[PDB]
Design an enzyme around this catalytic site. Sequence first.
Site, mmCIF file in Angstrom:
data_model
loop_
_atom_site.group_PDB
_atom_site.id
_atom_site.type_symbol
_atom_site.label_atom_id
_atom_site.label_comp_id
_atom_site.label_asym_id
_atom_site.label_seq_id
_atom_site.Cartn_x
_atom_site.Cartn_y
_atom_site.Cartn_z
ATOM 1 N N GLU A 125 -3.304 -9.501 10.126
ATOM 2 C CA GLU A 125 -2.326 -9.596 9.057
ATOM 3 C C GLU A 125 -2.036 -11.030 8.621
ATOM 4 O OE1 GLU A 125 -1.272 -7.428 7.057
ATOM 5 O OE2 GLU A 125 -1.486 -5.509 8.138
ATOM 6 N N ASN A 153 2.197 -9.349 -4.121
ATOM 7 C CA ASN A 153 1.357 -8.268 -4.634
ATOM 8 C C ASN A 153 1.725 -8.092 -6.109
ATOM 9 O OD1 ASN A 153 0.166 -7.218 -1.946
ATOM 10 N ND2 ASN A 153 2.369 -6.972 -1.561
ATOM 11 N N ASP A 206 2.626 -4.422 -7.821
ATOM 12 C CA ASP A 206 3.895 -3.708 -7.711
ATOM 13 C C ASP A 206 5.103 -4.589 -7.500
ATOM 14 O OD1 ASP A 206 3.719 -4.287 -4.925
ATOM 15 O OD2 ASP A 206 4.608 -2.342 -4.419
ATOM 16 N N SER A 264 5.945 -6.659 -5.083
ATOM 17 C CA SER A 264 6.532 -6.762 -3.743
ATOM 18 C C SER A 264 5.859 -7.930 -3.028
ATOM 19 C CB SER A 264 6.331 -5.462 -2.952
ATOM 20 O OG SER A 264 4.975 -5.275 -2.575
ATOM 21 N N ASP A 300 4.730 -9.539 0.985
ATOM 22 C CA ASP A 300 4.545 -9.294 2.422
ATOM 23 C C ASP A 300 5.046 -10.536 3.160
ATOM 24 O OD1 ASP A 300 3.144 -6.842 2.005
ATOM 25 O OD2 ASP A 300 1.387 -8.039 1.470
ATOM 26 N N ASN A 328 6.252 -5.475 4.273
ATOM 27 C CA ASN A 328 6.520 -5.406 2.839
ATOM 28 C C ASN A 328 7.970 -5.225 2.383
ATOM 29 O OD1 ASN A 328 6.327 -3.658 0.040
ATOM 30 N ND2 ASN A 328 4.806 -5.290 0.151
#
Length: 130
Positions: free
Chosen positions: A35, A46, A49, A51, A53, A60
Amino acid sequence: KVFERCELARTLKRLGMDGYRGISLANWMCLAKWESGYNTRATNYNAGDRSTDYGIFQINSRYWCNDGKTPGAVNACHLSCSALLQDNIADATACAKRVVRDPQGIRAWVAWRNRCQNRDVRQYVQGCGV
């Protein structure tokens, strides 16, 4: 902070991650590895959408933490996403634990499915004393 492998393994063990909801320490290590490369300040926007991380587990903002700029988002871990950018990973592990209490468990992270599921992950904890 960018943890070294074994340093992180013991840090996760101390925070109660080994076997949490049947998930082995090697699995969490593989997750953190893929990750963020064990980087607590890692972030990923991102565009699709809106959002982001956050942290070592790349959790998220749409469902887990509040950053205030993700449309219709919720904050299931009840934390400011900033808490997921700390060198101390206590809060990040609390939230990771919250994620896995849901039905999907460790499968919540697609990266885990792609690089850890059905893989030999023993190498992640070898020599760490855990």
